[PDB]
Amino acid sequence: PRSEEDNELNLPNLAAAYSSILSSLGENPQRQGLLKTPWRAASAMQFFTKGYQETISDVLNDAIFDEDHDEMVIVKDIDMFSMCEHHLVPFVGKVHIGYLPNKQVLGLSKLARIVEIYSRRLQVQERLTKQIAVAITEALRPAGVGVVVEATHMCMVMRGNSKTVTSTMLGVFREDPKTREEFLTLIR
Amino acid sequence: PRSEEDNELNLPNLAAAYSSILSSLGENPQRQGLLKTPWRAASAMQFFTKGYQETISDVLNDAIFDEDHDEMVIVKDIDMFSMCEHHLVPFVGKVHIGYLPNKQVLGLSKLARIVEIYSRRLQVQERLTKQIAVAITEALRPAGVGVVVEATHMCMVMRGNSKTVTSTMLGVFREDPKTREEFLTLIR
Amino acid sequence: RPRSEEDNELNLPNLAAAYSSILSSLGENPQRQGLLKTPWRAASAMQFFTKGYQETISDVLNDAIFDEDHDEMVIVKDIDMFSMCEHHLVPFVGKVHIGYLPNKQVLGLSKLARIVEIYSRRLQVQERLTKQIAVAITEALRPAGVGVVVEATHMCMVMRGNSKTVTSTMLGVFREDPKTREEFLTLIR
Amino acid sequence: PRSEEDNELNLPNLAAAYSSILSSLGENPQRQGLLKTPWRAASAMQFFTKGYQETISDVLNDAIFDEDHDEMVIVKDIDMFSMCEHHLVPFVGKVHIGYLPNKQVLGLSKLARIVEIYSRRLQVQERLTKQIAVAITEALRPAGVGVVVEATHMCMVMRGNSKTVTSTMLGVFREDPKTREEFLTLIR
Amino acid sequence: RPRSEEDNELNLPNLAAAYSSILSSLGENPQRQGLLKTPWRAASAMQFFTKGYQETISDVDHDEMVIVKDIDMFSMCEHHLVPFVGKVHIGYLPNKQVLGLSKLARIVEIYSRRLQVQERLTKQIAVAITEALRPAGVGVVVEATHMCMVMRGVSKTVTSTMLGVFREDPKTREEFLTLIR
Amino acid sequence: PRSEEDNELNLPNLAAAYSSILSSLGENPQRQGLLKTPWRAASAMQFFTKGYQETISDVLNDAIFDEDHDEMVIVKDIDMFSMCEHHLVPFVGKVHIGYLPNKQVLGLSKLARIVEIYSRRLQVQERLTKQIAVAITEALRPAGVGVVVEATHMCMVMRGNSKTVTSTMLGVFREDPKTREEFLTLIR
Amino acid sequence: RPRSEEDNELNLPNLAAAYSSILSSLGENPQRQGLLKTPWRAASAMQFFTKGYQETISDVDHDEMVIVKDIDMFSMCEHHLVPFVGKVHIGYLPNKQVLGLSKLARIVEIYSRRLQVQERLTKQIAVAITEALRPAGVGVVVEATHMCMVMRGVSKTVTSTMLGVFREDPKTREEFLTLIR
Amino acid sequence: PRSEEDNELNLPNLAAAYSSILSSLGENPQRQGLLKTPWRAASAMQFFTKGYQETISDVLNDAIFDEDHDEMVIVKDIDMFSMCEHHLVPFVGKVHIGYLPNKQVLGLSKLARIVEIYSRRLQVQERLTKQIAVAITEALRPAGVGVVVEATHMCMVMRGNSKTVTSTMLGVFREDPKTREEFLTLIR
Amino acid sequence: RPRSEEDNELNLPNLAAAYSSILSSLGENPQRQGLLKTPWRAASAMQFFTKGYQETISDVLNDAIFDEDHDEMVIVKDIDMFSMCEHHLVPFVGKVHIGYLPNKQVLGLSKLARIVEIYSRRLQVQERLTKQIAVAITEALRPAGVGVVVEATHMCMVMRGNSKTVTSTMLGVFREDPKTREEFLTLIR
Amino acid sequence: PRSEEDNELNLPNLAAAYSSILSSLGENPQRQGLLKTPWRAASAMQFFTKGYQETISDVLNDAIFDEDHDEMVIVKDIDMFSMCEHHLVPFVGKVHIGYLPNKQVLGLSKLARIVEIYSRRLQVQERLTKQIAVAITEALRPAGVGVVVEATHMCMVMRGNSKTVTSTMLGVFREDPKTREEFLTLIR
Ligand SMILES: [Zn+2]
Ligand SMILES: [Zn+2]
Ligand SMILES: [Zn+2]
Ligand SMILES: [Zn+2]
Ligand SMILES: [Zn+2]
Ligand SMILES: [Zn+2]
Ligand SMILES: [Zn+2]
Ligand SMILES: [Zn+2]
Ligand SMILES: [Zn+2]
Ligand SMILES: [Zn+2]
């Protein structure tokens, strides 16, 4: 994964590229709000991709056991902020996670941490959705997991708004349609 | 102003800077969705700053005369999409324009064209608001003009949403408070 | 003279002929199933959208009911309005909010709606339609004041990529007394 | 397809017909507001039918490939503006697209260009709905596609608002009712 | 004298006879199942809609503004005999005399259940409260949907009567109009 | 059907009956506000029952189109204004029509004319709902048709508000419950 | 036999006497201005809230599902004598017999204006409709806010009675529950 | 004030009166649902009037803070549940309190206890509003205080819904209209 | 044994002592005006937030009203719930939706609310609070089935940067019959 | 200010006190769910009061300069999460900031950092409101500043929701009532 040493070393390279963009756009990088912009844009881009620094394995250290709880757990409206890999323009929305545990439940804070690791990268919504559902499956080994991501893509909102919904259903969520209906009803 | 010849000439320079950013972020620019990204991001950035190509003077050729109309004209909820100059991150919202004419009214399409010229640039919301109000004042010479811009800045929404409202009041809109009250009530 | 049904009957084939020419000039086949009756359908639709030319404001004015001892503000809000943009021939639809302070003369609700219909069903500019409604009421009732607010969505710019246009005409006490104007704008919300 | 040479050549024909329409309606085409109307209404009509200039095959040449993703992708609330072919009066609304890919996904911007090519023509809502569904099927070869179009027809809004809903279901969207239920729930 | 139950009994066959004539004049068959009891049902409905004629208003340091908003109102248009329904918002500044909430609602019912003009219904309620309490001021706002124009293709008519301090002090009027929202 | 000759001949009869009603209610028909009421009420009642003048048979010509579409078409929120046949008091609301065509479609304006023909009469909501559904079935011969009418009855709103919903399901709408579920979901 | 106006006249002083005792037992002064007429006013209000006892239900190819939703309901909790207000949604599939809208509302009024349990009020209305029309099925849904627990710090209690085809056919029940939304 | 000893002693008296009410209404007090009702109603009525047990004077200690703030403090949407003194029927709603302090502030919990003391009694909304405003004035000696109570009276909602708004303005709230406007705007 | 008022009186100074230590460990001055009574105020607030320990589910169960001939679903939705996160000692507030199909035994509305209060006023995990409410109702009424849905906002993650947590326990016919479960989830909306 | 060395040193003290609180409340600190709670509640409390670690002077070193802009800037709906200093229970809401600059504007991210430094401390809403207003005044030296804070206090939400509104007006916001009216209208 990416490190703080890498970030320190690559910051002047990113600032050099951002200053070249300011020049190529027909702007004077030696003006009022454009003086510190090569560095500010570089630091913003490093923050938007800080998920590369994290590994899902080290975060996973919280699979708390449940006593006789064979019931569906849902965490809806988790704020998600990601970067489109095709155009390098943000896409912002919400993630709705649902699962049927098998003696192990994940902490609420840790569920939102999985969303953060994957969303803070150059992404495609379809991949971010599957990554979140696969991490949960591998962390808890549940009966099933359902992930629904609804986001507004700026790369087409700035072009002339429409929401993109992607859903990954695994285990009992994809096989039992009565379980899937319950999940989709409860996330409303 | 910027030209299509300039855009053709600077596109490979922008693509060279975007590919360097992909490399500096810890990504392989020779992969699936990252192959055409240096060019796609460069073309998106040229589109987001296409207002530099336009001049407010050539657009201004539509000051249609009015017969005995000394009444307030408002065009509210004009979609506005701009780029923050400090971080190079979008900021998206609406512009509400209002004016009291002096024998000359501007076409609705031309009012939204003023918003487009100024918004499609590296901006500060405060400047974009004043630029829109000054262009209208210089185009129509009215009794007064009021511009209210409400936008969501991604450079702070991606950091953890809050709307930023900036308002420029000129002429009778800044002097007569009864006129200003009417405008702010009608834009709701 | 206003437009008549005899004029409409006589000009319908001329409008259909022009619409058939438009279909061809746009690169369409006017002989295809869906376009066969279109020159006539578009012509009849355009005649309906401009039927306000057939009406006269003076002849609609016939019953100004004498509700004397009424020195209080009357408002008719959310009157549906459908008009045609005179610059591009594209619709613009919205609502008209009318308000007035009578001078021992009130106008019937149906007659206020007929004023909106006469002026809106024409090739218009929102600013003119607003003033025309306001002036018609002033001339019909001779009130203390009248306020007209028109909020409409112009398709000629919504089809180009979405913004309400608000125009307001204040006459008499509505124009002069700001406390009267504040009451009107609050009540139309 | 229609070209810019065709548009330049047919503009005076359209302006001549529009001038005739102003006269046939009982208007004075020499009055201030109507002077440039034959040309303005001609250029507006050319813009409303600019989809004739575009070809679907040339636009559909950029389909992204994603493996192990047999999950439903939805793009809802896509703004749509079309022309009624029976009366030449607009009909505006939203398009909701949904599909189950077969190792091939379409870019969000390209989905919006399919809606634009077909909607910017003299249409019937039923045809526009099928055209979009077919364009997606041809571009991706997916398991199934669903298109729902909700529009307000100015023909029966200017006559005294009622929404018209048309839906085209293809492949697994048509056959599996559990897939169709999920799509219709998610577009709400 | 106000209308009585003796008059309602005596005039019911007259109203039923007129409604029988209306069904025929409209091109309907008054002998069909759904129209058989209609001359009597319409007559009794019209008597109920105008039952306010039977009633008489004469029968029906804590000085702070009192407001009773969203009082349901159902009246009949006197020009076309078509209903108009809405809400009444009443406000007043007392002078050591307040009115019961049920009695304020009875004033609205007495005047609304008659052949009306919205402007008159608004003034009649404001005058009744002024005469009952002798307050510093009273404000009445009526917002109604007239079916005689909604059935013709079109939403709300607002009429307001301001008396006393409500009419004179604009700061009092602003407070009232803000609070009824 | 009723004619304009009949309306001219019966207007004084209706005015005579309305004048008698004013007297029977204890009003003075000579007062300013009631003088023209016998004629105004008579003309209003003739307008509310103008559907008697129209014939359903004279509406099918130059209305039925040919689609080649087996997909569901819905026209929701059609404003409906009718008169209660029991008390002669209005009942106003919305009609939602849906159908699965069989190589025959119906123009949107003609669907609205079916609602107007039947609603502008002395009605019972149950009958108005069935009459619309039968008219569409006879005009198009479709796979199925569904009609839902939701109206507020003034004859009980004036007595102390409550919406009445009546639904007629024919063909595949009546038999296939999965089709009926889709229709009822889409009209929301 | 049902309650009569003779019983309302005879029992009013008994109820007023009991309400006089309640004011004193609560620690109030029944002679203060606001409480003077309260023993009689509370007694008459309680008689009105239970006026359904006076009424008797026995007195009060177009076979498609008919629904009357959002019928206003105002009842009294029989456990604590505290009101509970809400809405009744009625639905039925007729068998060549339909009921007038006003008569459906009168069924709700007869049973709601009594000392009730929501579960019973729901079943009584469903049974009355079944006995009046003999339909294919009937569905009654009552959603009410109980003041006896809202005044204690807490929003809606939903009770549903499904009879005939509404109980048996789940596709019919789904349609009804969808349409009442 | 009323005590727990008084409540214990008067509970059988209230139960006796409630049993008499059940009989006077034509009910059988021996039926299952009514058996414990004389005691349940008695305990409910004692709870609804528990404000008699409290004293306003015993609430000011360990409650008044010292701020050095001359800015307006507002506590809106305080749930209020009271009993009509004319009919013994509840009236429920919200209290909105506002004040301009004079070097003396009041704890949020103690403001809510003032509302509870006065509301839990046989009341008239006008009195409850003034009693709260006077209690705050006497506790803090502020520049001004404003109390707005909006409640639904069941004694008229059960008769056929309508909100009653009462407002008491004291000090600068009564005198300065610009202060009163700010308060009424902020409580919305 | 459950917690008592004698226990609360005895442990209040111990809780106040611990809270005073927390103020110091956080870098605050416990002698400043606003913090003087805080060790006692926080201690009393924490005792109130955990007052459910003082209650017993068996003793609250005393009136299972015999509403026989009721083979229909009873729902009590939007019951306000306020609880304490056992992991971080931070509140989590929301609503509880309860539903059940009785077997000639119904529970009073007030008693259903008392079950929610007993379990919620403790150091909890939403999953446990949901199952505890469900099991208490099953044991009190022996019904055909019971459904409990709890939707709450956890401050321990809203204060960290905003998401509702929904937990549902389905027992008996609610768990087995999917048509019953669909009806319950539709009616709680 | 507080440091990371202080946090490391005081964590076992806080954990020891939290372990004592679990015992004093009648809980078994050895049960699964409570085992790591002394440390988790200690770290949560340290996060809720991390504003003590920050200094306002070090953050306020980046104020942008804009000339000829004497127009009002507003940042509304800034999420705020604070701790009640009387009971140590959270209070969450929104901050609405407004100001009239004097050739000096503050970055949107820096306005949000002022809210964070002061809100992440044991507070009283009245103080937090004044602190933010003062921090802006000191950083920009503007014509005037307005701060409105709306929060829900868990002290009186867990006890039986009412919002608390506090407003601090400085400079022209305090003196000119027409400026104050505009600000309060725009934050709605
Ligand atoms: Zn993109
Ligand atoms: Zn920025
Ligand atoms: Zn135009
Ligand atoms: Zn058409
Ligand atoms: Zn009328
Ligand atoms: Zn009727
Ligand atoms: Zn009760
Ligand atoms: Zn009362
Ligand atoms: Zn936690
Ligand atoms: Zn507190």
> How far is the alpha carbon of B35 from chain D, nearest alpha carbon, in Å?
11
Of A33, A64, A65, the CB nearest to J64: A33
CA dist J78 → H75, J82, J91 (Å): 20, 13, 14
Count Cα atoms within 13 angstroms, Cβ side, for E82: 27
What residues of H are in contact with residue G21 (Cβ under 8 Å)? Answer: 13, 16-17
Nearest to B88 by CA among A87, A40, A30, A157: A40
β-bridge partners, I161: none
Chain J residues contacting B via beta carbons under 8 Å = 64, 66, 68-69, 71-79, 105, 107-109, 112, 178, 181-182, 185-188
Of C34, C37, C66, the CB nearest to F62: C37
The torsion angles phi and psi of J59, rounded to 5 degrees, stand at -75, -45
Chain B residues contacting J via beta carbons under 8 Å = 86, 124, 126-127, 129-130, 148, 153, 155-156, 159-169, 177, 180-181, 184, 188
The count of other CB atoms within 10 Å of the CB of residue F103 is 12
Active site residue I87: yes
G89 assigned to a ligand binding site: no
Active site residue A150: no
Contact A188, A172 (CB under 8 A): no
β-bridge partners, F17: none
State how far the Cα of F54 lies from the Cα of F71, in Å rounded to an integer. 31
β-bridge partners, I113: none
CB pairs under 8 A between B and C: 64
Count Cα atoms within 13 angstroms, Cβ side, for D136: 35
Nearest to C58 by CA among C114, C4, C101: C114
Any idea what DSSP says for residue C62? -
Neighbours of ion ligand 7 (CB under 5 A): G 77, 79-80, 148
- Token pair in block for residue J5: 């060395």
CA dist G172 → B41, E139, F180 (Å): 55, 51, 10
What residues of C are in contact with residue F36 (Cβ under 8 Å)? Answer: 63
CB distance I80–G123 less than 8 Å? no
Chains B and E, touching by 3 or more CB pairs within 8 angstroms: no
Q: G11 by DSSP, 3-state: which?
A: helix
**CB neighbour list of residue H20: distance below 8 Å, 6 or more residues apart:** G14, G17, G18
The count of other CB atoms within 10 Å of the CB of residue I121 is 21
The torsion angles phi and psi of J85, rounded to 5 degrees, stand at -75, -20
State how far the Cα of H98 lies from the Cα of H167, in Å rounded to an integer. 11
Is residue F53 packed enough to be buried (19+ CB in 10 Å), middle (13-18) or exposed (0-12)? Answer: middle
What residues of B are in contact with residue D33 (Cβ under 8 Å)? Answer: 64
Query: In chain E, where does DSSP find H-type helix?
Result: 5-25, 38-49, 101-112, 118-133, 147-150, 165-168, 170-179
Least CA distance to F63: which residue of chain C?
C37
CB pairs under 8 A between A and D: 66
> How far is the alpha carbon of A87 from chain B, nearest alpha carbon, in Å?
4
Contact D96, D76 (CB under 8 A): yes
Of H48, H86, H122, the CB nearest to G28: H122
What CA dihedral angle connects J119, J122, J123 and J129, to 10 degrees?
-20
CA–centroid distance, C74 to ligand 5, in Å, is: 16
Nearest to J48 by CA among J154, J138, J140: J154
Least CA distance to H153: which residue of chain E?
E101
Q: Which of these is catalytic: J87, J126, J138, J181? A: J87
The count of other CB atoms within 10 Å of the CB of residue H150 is 20
- Token pair in block for residue G166: 């509404």
From start to end of B26-183, where are the E strands? 73-84, 90-100, 122-123, 144-153, 163-171
**CB neighbour list of residue G87: distance below 8 Å, 6 or more residues apart:** G69, G70, G71, G72, G73, G142, G143, G144
CB distance E148–C77 less than 8 Å? no
Q: Which of these is catalytic: H46, H54, H84, H123? A: H84
CA dist C31 → C20, C28, C39, F103 (Å): 10, 9, 11, 21
State how far the Cα of A45 lies from the Cα of A89, in Å rounded to an integer. 11
State how far the Cα of D137 lies from the Cα of D160, in Å rounded to an integer. 38
Contact H24, G18 (CB under 8 A): yes
Of D112, D182, D186, the CB nearest to A156: D112
> How far is the alpha carbon of H40 from chain G, nearest alpha carbon, in Å?
5
What residues of I are in contact with residue J33 (Cβ under 8 Å)? Answer: 86-87, 123, 125
Chains J and B, touching by 3 or more CB pairs within 8 angstroms: yes
Please identify which residue in the block is written with the tokens 């017969």. Answer: B67
Active site residue F96: no
> How far is the alpha carbon of A105 from chain J, nearest alpha carbon, in Å?
12
Neighbours of ion ligand 4 (CB under 5 A): D 84, 86-87, 155
**CB neighbour list of residue I42: distance below 8 Å, 6 or more residues apart:** I15, I16, I19, J87, J88, J89
Contact H102, H146 (CB under 8 A): no
- Token pair in block for residue E93: 């500044």
CA dist E176 → E69, E180, H97 (Å): 10, 6, 18
β-bridge partners, G9: none
Chains F and C, touching by 3 or more CB pairs within 8 angstroms: yes
Q: F162 by DSSP, 3-state: which?
A: coil
First to last CA, chain E: 39
**CB neighbour list of residue D122: distance below 8 Å, 6 or more residues apart:** C23, C26, C28, C34, C35, D49, D83, D84, D85, D88
**CB neighbour list of residue A146: distance below 8 Å, 6 or more residues apart:** A96, A97, A98, A99, A133, A167, A168, A169, A170, A173, A180, A183
Strands H122-123 and H73-84, sheet pairing: parallel
What residues of D are in contact with residue A130 (Cβ under 8 Å)? Answer: 68-69, 71
CA–centroid distance, F24 to ligand 5, in Å, is: 20
State how far the Cα of G144 lies from the Cα of A88, in Å rounded to an integer. 53
Of J162, J164, J167, the CB nearest to H71: J167
The count of other CB atoms within 10 Å of the CB of residue J26 is 18
> For chain J, percent helix, then strand, then coil, each to nearest 5?
45, 25, 30
CB distance J126–H185 less than 8 Å? no
Active site residue A53: no
Resolution (A): 2.6
List the determination method: X-ray
**CB neighbour list of residue H63: distance below 8 Å, 6 or more residues apart:** H106, H107, H110, H139
Q: Left if phi > 0, otherwise alpha if psi is -120 to 50, otherwise beta: which for C76?
A: beta
Active site residue J86: yes
Contact F10, E26 (CB under 8 A): yes
State how far the Cα of J5 lies from the Cα of I173, in Å rounded to an integer. 57
- Give the containing element (helix H, strand E) for E71: strand E66-77
Chains H and B, touching by 3 or more CB pairs within 8 angstroms: no
Residues of C with catalytic function: 85-88, 126, 154, 156
State how far the Cα of H95 lies from the Cα of J136, in Å rounded to an integer. 33
State how far the Cα of C85 lies from the Cα of J111, in Å rounded to an integer. 45
Neighbours of ion ligand 3 (CB under 5 A): C 85, 87-88, 156
CB distance I37–H62 less than 8 Å? yes
CA dist H129 → A164, H101, H150 (Å): 51, 19, 10
Contact J78, J94 (CB under 8 A): yes
Burial J57-68 (b: 16+ CB within 10 A, else e): eeebeeebebee
Of C33, C34, C66, the CB nearest to F32: C66
Report the residue count for chain F. Answer: 188
For chain D, how big is the Rg over CA atoms in Å?
A: 20
CB pairs under 8 A between G and I: 61
Neighbours of ion ligand 8 (CB under 5 A): H 84, 86-87, 155
Is residue H156 packed enough to be buried (19+ CB in 10 Å), middle (13-18) or exposed (0-12)? Answer: buried
The torsion angles phi and psi of H84, rounded to 5 degrees, stand at -65, 130
Nearest to G112 by CA among G178, G48, G163: G48
CA torsion through residues B47, B52, B53, B57, sign: positive
State how far the Cα of G42 lies from the Cα of G30, in Å rounded to an integer. 13
What residues of F are in contact with residue C105 (Cβ under 8 Å)? Answer: none
CB distance D81–C28 less than 8 Å? no
Of G62, G67, G174, the CB nearest to F164: G67
Contact C164, C54 (CB under 8 A): no
CB distance A25–B88 less than 8 Å? no
Q: Which of these is catalytic: F85, F126, F138, F181? A: F85
